[PDB]
């Protein structure tokens, strides 16, 4: 029913006790027995209910340490913005014509950023991207006047966070390879952006439960005060 | 049935005038072009 490794990690974890953030990062590094560079992801169960148009939140947050996995960058740009993409060193720079080839080609690029003007040409393709979630969004900022900032943020490891329907928003803070101290710093940045992201119409405690888990490791409640 | 009524200015929502109308003879809200002292010009006043 449960692997011996998971069972040992479960005994390590305290269901009753919500760890501090530092204890949680250390404990996750302990729990991920499987010998692969598993990521560490945290879930916040917000009080807000997405179905209300105001309540639903969608944003993108940069991490000073990064995700621990590099990210490919796709850019839709024209003229000076293409020049800026080249300066930024984006993996791919494309035009309205190359979007068709991008459909079915150069796939697996982590994220897309399109210039405002391009969005009109991009949107036709974006209908395909919509279900994929690749299409850029102004609120996340992936639509920008300058592509350089988006490229460097993507390189820096910017993570897009979108509240799930159930109301638990999950985000990877970093790789187990990153030191527990770096992982907790990523978590602190995530917590701050969420607090600022709390909508006005929201009421009551913002977060019902915060749980940290490695890819293999089980969920660990983390004290909100910590 | 004749009843007292108030004519409110559409432009400023001011209840400038009092009058009366027969409901049966004038089922719909009465509308008149009357001078609005606040705006100092003729405006459409509708019963409320």
């Amino acid at each position: 029913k449960k692997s011996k490794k998971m069972q040992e990690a479960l005994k390590k974890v305290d269901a009753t006790k919500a760890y501090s953030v530092e204890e949680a990062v250390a404990l996750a590094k302990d729990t991920n027995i499987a010998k692969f560079d598993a990521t560490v992801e945290v879930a916040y169960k917000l009080n807000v209910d997405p179905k209300k148009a105001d309540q639903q939140i969608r944003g993108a947050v940069v991490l000073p340490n990064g995700t621990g996995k590099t990210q490919t960058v796709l850019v839709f740009a024209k003229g000076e913005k293409a020049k800026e993409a080249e300066a930024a060193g984006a993996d791919f720079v494309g035009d309205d014509d190359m979007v068709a080839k991008i459909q079915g080609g150069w796939f697996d690029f982590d994220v897309v950023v399109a210039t405002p003007d391009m969005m009109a040409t991009v949107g036709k393709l974006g209908r395909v991207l919509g279900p994929k979630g690749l299409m850029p969004n102004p609120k996340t900022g992936t639509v920008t006047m300058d592509v350089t900032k988006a490229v460097e943020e993507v390189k820096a490891g910017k993570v897009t966070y979108r509240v799930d329907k159930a109301g638990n928003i999950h985000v990877p803070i970093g790789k187990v390879s990153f030191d527990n101290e770096k992982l907790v710093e990523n978590f602190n940045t995530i917590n701050d952006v969420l607090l600022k992201a709390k909508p006005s119409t929201a009421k009551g405690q913002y977060i019902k439960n915060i749980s940290v888990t490695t890819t293999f490791g089980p969920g660990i409640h983390v004290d909100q005060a910590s | 049935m004749r009843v007292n009524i108030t004519l409110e200015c559409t432009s400023c929502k001011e209840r400038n005038y009092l009058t009366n109308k027969n409901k049966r003879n004038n089922p719909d809200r009465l509308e008149k072009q009357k001078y609005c002292p606040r705006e100092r010009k003729v405006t459409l006043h509708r019963e409320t």
Binding site: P50, K52, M119, N137, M145 | P27
Partner: protein
């Protein structure tokens, strides 16, 4: 849903006089009254189409699925598929969103803030009304009332009264509502079709207000009955 001191008088003939009502959530309310009692008018108040002369009518923020007593055919040439598709705001937002993209090219640094916000809401709203519905609707007809696909390409005005009621009823369900306001949902339906509607409404977990002159149909569904009095102008 709550109404206090409700008053409404069209000309000389009055509908509500100091009427009041409180409906709890998750109540399959059966609205009953003689013709002209003001049952349809109540929904118009809930839908904010009408305004009470005096009093307060309180409605929850949840999305409402409204089934009009009369079919709304904006144009004679509208096809059944066009009529049903209009239930969801997918098409309307895309037309607005497409214009937003046009403005983005025209405007460089003036309206971008407003356009970007409008684009963001439309995308988030569009994803909220998941654009996969194009396939779901096609199969909602099959599972709902065995509505043949040949009708799907036919002008709606040419359908039969019973057929129109199925389309209108399906459109309400297609909208994926939170509160159901059904105004005579079985006006033209035959015996077989009525069976499906009854079973679905029995299972429907949410609140559903039903205006019906079919006592047996209501008895199988209704748990609370609201009577609109024609002489006392009360509820």
């Amino acid at each position: 849903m709550r109404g206090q001191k409700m008053n409404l008088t069209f000309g000389l003939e009055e509908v509500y006089e100091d009427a009041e009502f409180h409906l709890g959530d998750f109540d399959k309310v059966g609205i009953v009254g003689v013709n002209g009692a003001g049952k349809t008018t109540l929904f118009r108040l809930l839908l904010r189409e009408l305004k009470l002369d005096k009093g307060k009518i309180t409605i929850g923020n949840s999305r409402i699925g409204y089934l009009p007593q009369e079919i709304i055919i904006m144009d004679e040439k509208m096809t059944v598929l066009e009529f049903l598709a209009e239930g969801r705001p997918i098409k309307k937002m895309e037309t607005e969103l497409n214009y937003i993209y046009e403005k983005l090219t025209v405007v460089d640094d003036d309206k971008q803030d407003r356009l970007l916000k409008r684009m963001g809401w439309l995308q988030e709203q569009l994803e909220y009304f998941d654009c996969y519905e194009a396939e779901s609707i096609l199969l909602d007809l099959v599972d709902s009332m065995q509505i043949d696909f040949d009708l799907f390409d036919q002008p709606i005005s040419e359908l039969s009264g019973g057929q129109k009621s199925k389309i209108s009823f399906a459109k309400v369900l297609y909208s994926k509502p939170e509160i159901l306001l059904l105004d005579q949902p079985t006006n033209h339906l035959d015996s077989s079709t009525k069976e499906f509607v009854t079973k679905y409404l029995k299972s429907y977990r949410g609140s559903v207000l039903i205006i019906s002159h079919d006592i047996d149909f209501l008895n199988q569904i209704i748990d609370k009955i609201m009577y609109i009095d024609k002489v006392t102008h009360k509820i």
